[PDB]
RNA sequence: AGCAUAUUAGUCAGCGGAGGAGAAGUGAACAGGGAAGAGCCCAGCGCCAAUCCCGCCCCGGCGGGGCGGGGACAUGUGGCGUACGGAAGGGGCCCAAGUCCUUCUGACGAGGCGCCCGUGGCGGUGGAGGCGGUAGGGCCCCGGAGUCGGGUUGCUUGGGAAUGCAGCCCAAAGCGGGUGGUAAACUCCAUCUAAGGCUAAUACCGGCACGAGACCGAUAGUCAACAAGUACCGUAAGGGAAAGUUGAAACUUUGAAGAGAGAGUUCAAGAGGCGUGAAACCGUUCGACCCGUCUUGAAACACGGACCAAGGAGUCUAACACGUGCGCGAGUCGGGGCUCGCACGAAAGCCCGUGGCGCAAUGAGCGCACGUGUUAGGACCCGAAAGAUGGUGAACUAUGCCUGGGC
RNA sequence: CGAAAGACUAACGAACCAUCUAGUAGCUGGUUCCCUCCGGGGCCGCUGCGGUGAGCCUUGAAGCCUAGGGCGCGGGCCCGGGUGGAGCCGCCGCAGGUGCAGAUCUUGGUGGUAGUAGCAAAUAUUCAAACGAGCUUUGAAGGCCGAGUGGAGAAGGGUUCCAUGUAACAGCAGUUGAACAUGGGUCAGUCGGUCCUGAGAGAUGGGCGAGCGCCGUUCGAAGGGACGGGCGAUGGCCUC
RNA sequence: GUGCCAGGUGGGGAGUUUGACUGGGGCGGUAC
RNA sequence: UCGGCUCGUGCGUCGAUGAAGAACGCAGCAGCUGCGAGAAUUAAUGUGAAUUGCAGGACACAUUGAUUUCGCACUUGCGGCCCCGGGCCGGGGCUACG
């Protein structure tokens, strides 16, 4: 435990680290909010409105 | 293997080894006969270890 | 009547859970009532039995004599008491197992954990009363 | 003439041909009364 | 002499122990068929130790958390 | 009732590829009513490399900012824009009330106070609301080619001069092309815009974790309530059991010994490593042919039946017919929705009449229930010789080869 | 595969294994309570559910046994007695995997046969002693095997090997055992494997193939290795 | 030569059929 | 009756960071089960005085505090490259295809 905590402090901040020091969630999980300028402009010009009926 | 067994015996019991014979027993354990150097008495060494 | 789902009320499931309970659950299952004096003092009805001075109120050994608990064999769901015992064939003496629900705790072996457990139970009781 | 793997299989099969310890008969929920015993002539190994 | 006499000439083994399935399954894929469901259930996920899947189930019940510890005393 | 087309059936077996959903975007469609509801993006044509990937410094889904080098890219990246036109919740710990009086018992019963709690009336403990629990609470620009279409072949479909798919040959057009359920020529009309792409009511006999049942109760229910896919069988593919229950609580003497006689425990061993404990089987104390069955005819020299226990064969679904019972009646009948929360409640209650059947025929009462009959399904139960798909074997034997041994 | 007999292909005129498959059968077998009527009724019976019986029960439920007392045309039922030890039944409805003598029925158990068939292939045993509660061991005889009933291995077995100790099994017995129990035992540069390729098996390239894949084994840019020389090997600081 | 279609050949192989009545069945016959 | 069967609900998570599955091994004194040479389990957290068939835990009273094997090949056969230590031996890291 002491060795591995020292190793994790050592490799913190490095782009590439040993595989055992990389998170292991699930092969599928290791393999989103980017929008095109077109979609951003569409959202800005036509946002969803809050409305009520029969008033 | 025989080299590893000889080195391990030398380091653990601070002794010299003449030769090592090995067999694998019919129960799956490996038995080693370590013949010591002539200038070492296996009886005294065994007493030091605890056997005999 | 039980209304909460995720609670079984099924006989086979209840019995399986009871008979395969881990020891830390068997601790609270093996609980005994406190005497009237202790119940009045601590405002607590029952406590898990510890390795305590108790009385026997059911069975062949029921009576007023007070004996110290000497063993809590949670595997067999019985406690051994100081003088509640029997003679074997060869004359040796063996303890007779008593279920904790048939014993009344007259004196508590108190430590910090026991005192904090009693305080927790009393505070919950007084919150409920209010 | 044996291989290492066959000999290890035989050793494991030998270490399983012993009677149950007697004290296991004294346990709280014991249903066993004796040992899956194998005899070299009566039953043959899977080889 | 096709019976008892011929049974005495049995000295050479056709089969030996397999290094993958252990039975007395070199193809990368495993031999399995739908016409023998009994054989399929004799060897399937859950008949072994599952020495990695059970831990996966336990970790799923908590969201696959890692890099954290319960709060120290 | 044969059988070849057909059916079985685009089904079983076989192969490939996933996701939490996927895909889509004999005998069907459309319209109608609901559940849900969501729309979009390229290429192309145009204008303006405006685009993307890969050392230093500063802030457990490796991103953001600054600075400098390399590459991709003009055989085309990016912005505008594509038919509707465009541009200019988990985990942990807790919380009510009888072990009151008499009494039964080996030890929650019975008789009282009905006493006490109740937002609380399953399990354990030697028949319990009064130990765990439970209930409810706490911490101007504008179109996709070997593509459409055509022929032919094979499969496929309800698709019929050919619904879809695929091979081969031919092989496009642009006021064009497809469709308009009968082939074709001419001609009006309607409708959409193929040959590029993305996209959130439904399914779930595997898995994780739960709840429940007019289900089975150890020859039943999973093969498996138990050291069960175990023991065991087969070279192998594979095949595959039987098997739950003591109780409430676990010294003397004969004999070589197993085994007995006393003694002892327990309510009980007339419970002794086993609840109760049946039958078959054994130890001891005058008329009258054998049933079941097929048969014209059975006591038959026709077949099955040594004996006893347990199991064992007309079921369920759908359709139709008739009969009967009930409600309403020219009508009658509610998949979806709304009722606070799911003990009972997957109940019950209420409503959208779309629709079904009936009220009209001819030509090219309803709904509910019960019974009986005829069916399709394993179809009252057991029973072939066969057929098909995919696999395992040349340890016997058959033949060829290699390398040995022998006469 | 067959010097051919439809022979052999793990005890064949189309192997074995699983599935389709509970394949189909105008054919054989079986098809479970009583009474009544013609030629439906069951205060019959079984299991479970809704109601009801201020039902029954450790002062003893179910179940089982009984040359006890009865009822019913009977399907059956009631009561007495025993032993048993924890639940059960009546009535009104509802529901069904609901009644057995047969099926060369399934599973389990048990008879007569019956203390019967039988324990008859390979020449053969005897005397004495010892241990022991009671065919073994020792000695002595007489015999046998005589290309072995001798001494060693391969395949196969897998602890059966050795010692000690001692109900079931060794179709009589056992003081004995390949049985049971406890504990031991297999030592390699030199004896094998390991190395070679033999018949052959089988990757890569390539081809084929819906696909798992399989065809092919020489039909492709298939060399990763050589003492010798200089930059830089300088490195021990240049011997190799 | 290969791919596709067309004609022939094709018990090498596949599937199937090979009536009924009837002084048993077959042969005969038709009382089908 | 701590087992089945049936219905329903929620979720719907495998793998080269090496899975499913197999083998072997691990307890003071076979199986099943649980584990991996740290082997009948270590750490942490919660809980709180047991585990138990048998004697055997000083359980700091701040009761920290009981409860492996399955680069080339499949015979442990044979390598190669780079480091480390001991003088060839041992250790570590690499060396599959697309």
Residue numbers in the entry:
A (entry chain h): 63 to 93, 100 to 123
B (entry chain X): 105 to 156
C (entry chain Y): 1 to 51, 53 to 131
D (entry chain l): 4 to 38, 40 to 51
E (entry chain j): 2 to 25, 37, 40 to 87
How does the study describe this entry?
The conserved Sec61 protein‐conducting channel facilitates polypeptide translocation and coordinates cotranslational polypeptide‐processing events. In cells, the majority of Sec61 is stably associated with a heterotetrameric membrane protein complex, the translocon‐associated protein complex (TRAP), yet the mechanism by which TRAP assists in polypeptide translocation remains unknown. One complex that promotes Sec61‐mediated ER insertion in a client‐specific manner in many eukaryotes is the heterotetrameric translocon‐associated protein (TRAP) complex (Görlich & Rapoport, 1993; Fons et al, 2003). Here, we present a single‐particle cryogenic electron microscopy (cryo‐EM) structure and an atomic model of the mammalian ribosome‐bound Sec61/TRAP translocon complex.
The extracted particles were further refined using heterogeneous and homogeneous 3D refinement to yield a reconstruction of the entire ribosome/Sec61/TRAP complex with an overall resolution of 2.7 Å. Resolution at the membrane regions of Sec61 and TRAP varied between 4.0 and 6.5 Å, whereas resolution for the ER lumenal TRAP domains was limited to between 5.5 and 7.0 Å, presumably due to high mobility of this flexibly tethered unit. TRAPγ forms a four‐helix TM bundle with the C‐terminal end positioned in proximity with the N‐terminal end of Sec61γ, and the TRAPγ subunit resides predominantly in the membrane with its helical section extending to the cytosolic side where it contacts the ribosome. The transmembrane anchors of TRAPβ and TRAPδ form a bundle with the TRAPγ TM1 (Ser35‐Arg49) and TM3 (Glu116‐Ile156). TRAPα, TRAPβ, and TRAPδ subunits each contain a small folded beta sheet‐rich lumenal domain that is connected to the transmembrane segments via flexible linker sequences. These three domains form a tight complex of ∼50 × 60 × 45 Å in the ER lumen, which may contribute to the structural integrity of the TRAP complex. The TRAPα lumenal domain is positioned immediately below the central channel of Sec61α where nascent polypeptides emerge after Sec61 plug displacement. The TRAPα lumenal domain is connected to a long 43‐residue transmembrane helix, which interacts with the Sec61 lumenal hinge loop and traverses the membrane diagonally forming a connection with backside of Sec61γ on the cytosolic domain of Sec61.
